[PDB]
Design a protein around this ligand. Structure first.
Ligand SMILES: CCC[C@H](CC)Oc1ccc(C(C)(C)C)cc1NC(=O)c1nnn(-c2cc(C)c(OC)cc2OC)c1C
Ligand SMILES: CCC[C@H](CC)Oc1ccc(C(C)(C)C)cc1NC(=O)c1nnn(-c2cc(C)c(OC)cc2OC)c1C
Lengths: 280, 278
């Protein structure tokens, strides 16, 4: 059984996920729409090619088929839209962290440093909960992103297919979010041991939950599988971040909030600082 | 062959068609699109006319609009109102090039263009219609339909007319015969336009005899005239249903309101009068 401290830790995380994750994407509007290492960027960008479907309240459907790779900026057509979506998702991640009692008690320098290092990873974990592995589509309410064994080569697509195969619960997803958020080895964190103390209790709570709720033989070593996925997500974060910084200086697409996340801390992270001081 | 006067009439009509028909639709711009957000009688008609909008981009991307199943039934009417308006402005310029049309009084020029507006649009639309795929290919824009379709007279017209496989000269002659209809409302010089229409029909009949196999196309001219008569029926059939829709959900552009009668002949068609004098 779970200790009372662990039972209330899970309920606080799940309560935070409910209040901050707009699974229907009803409040996501006002977004843009399409009107050697460079070759590796283009190849991975081609592997991540998706078609955008926008369903309307009346029943109509707008569908956007991306262009084919012919050399030029046409393969970066959906990046401005994806930058508006990532910013909307990250704002929900900010509100998720503010609701957590263990997070708001941290200094404002560590709150910015932690959210800077876990922004991409927290966004990927929420995307996997709406990812359709049967059709290769991210069902984001009114919006859909359908991909166009060789695509599993791209580590970001393989991560979503492998993570979806585990069939995690809501409690396990939100515990992965906490472990990813309270990483003591992020750049800029000062209270290394304090956030390390918090991270271990989330992993201990996750390990206790799985042992008390998943006796099935298909769930053997599930906790260690999850921890191995979090280490893999740390890598893909580095792979995708360096990939986008190379696209940003050639073809600028990042929203003002994304530029701060990529690089006093509160002085060059004004948008994130004001959002941390605001309320629900 | 044809007489020199008939050869000049065809050369003049082909010259007008070339200068005023944008076959690529490259100059069709700034049109409304569906946003991202007898009632049963009319609803059945345009439900049979339900089409999807495809929009090809310069880079190769394709935006496709899927209309909704049965106010949502009139989602593509603002866009079609901008399309019909763009088409008519080319119809006006087509009539202004024909010498037999300028010499008519400005009131009769309005009356003829008012009665032949819908018909000359369908005739030009037919030249870009693909019967195999059921799509009107208007350059970057495509309109694909969504035996059940032949019951609709407007769809049966485009399929039967395309089946005749007319030449460019036969299409523009249909436009002239349709334009110079002597029985349009408000026409005063009916005797002049009747004799003008007869010369176009005689030229069309003579063209078919001289440029087609004699026994195979023995009734091609009479088939064409039957299509024009059928097109007049569809004209009143589509004008009434849109006049009903306009009272419910306004969509017609200012120029369409004058053509339908929404508020002297030139005083009730100020926009159409101005375009004729420019
Ligand atoms: C991967 C699964 C989810 C999506 C479908 C919904 O799949 C795609 C499908 C297609 C495309 C293309 C448009 C083809 C490039 C992109 C993506 N996906 C991203 O482009 C993304 N995913 N995360 N981030 C990101 C987010 C934040 C807060 C951040 O802050 C430091 C940094 C980030 O990247 C370094 C980002 C920017
Ligand atoms: C049939 C071939 C043409 C198109 C595709 C190219 O197919 C459609 C496909 C779908 C739809 C719907 C939006 C579903 C209703 C309409 C249409 N089609 C028209 O909406 C039209 N066709 N002609 N007219 C029109 C034009 C003029 C100058 C006018 O002035 C007196 C009056 C008119 O209507 C009475 C008009 C207004």
């Amino acid at each position: 059984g779970l200790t009372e401290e662990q039972r209330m830790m899970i309920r606080e995380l799940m309560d935070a996920q409910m209040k901050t994750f707009d699974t229907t994407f009803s409040h996501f509007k006002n977004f843009r729409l399409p009107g050697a290492k460079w070759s590796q960027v283009r190849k991975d960008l081609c592997s991540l090619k998706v078609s955008l479907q926008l369903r309307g309240e009346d029943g109509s459907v707008w569908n956007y088929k991306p262009p084919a790779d012919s050399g030029g900026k046409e393969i970066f057509s959906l990046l401005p839209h994806m930058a508006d979506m990532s910013t909307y998702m990250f704002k929900g991640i900010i509100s998720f962290a503010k609701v957590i009692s263990y997070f708001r008690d941290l200094p404002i320098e560590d709150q910015i440093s932690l959210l800077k290092g876990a922004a991409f990873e927290l966004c990927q974990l929420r995307f996997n909960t709406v990812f359709n592995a049967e059709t290769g589509t991210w069902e984001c309410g009114r919006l859909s992103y359908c991909l166009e064994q060789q695509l599993l080569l791209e580590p970001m697509l393989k991560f979503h297919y492998m993570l979806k195969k585990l069939q995690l619960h809501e409690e396990e997803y939100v515990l992965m979010q906490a472990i990813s958020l309270f990483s003591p080895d992020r750049p800029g964190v000062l209270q290394h041991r304090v956030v390390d103390q918090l991270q271990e209790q989330f992993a201990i709570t996750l390990k206790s939950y799985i042992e008390c709720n998943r006796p099935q033989p298909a769930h053997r070593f599930l906790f260690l599988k999850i921890m191995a996925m979090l280490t893999e997500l740390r890598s893909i974060n580095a792979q995708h971040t360096q990939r986008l910084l190379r696209i940003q200086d050639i073809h600028p697409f990042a929203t003002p909030l994304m530029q701060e996340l990529f690089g006093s801390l509160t002085e060059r992270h004004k948008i994130l600082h004001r959002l941390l001081q605001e309320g629900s």
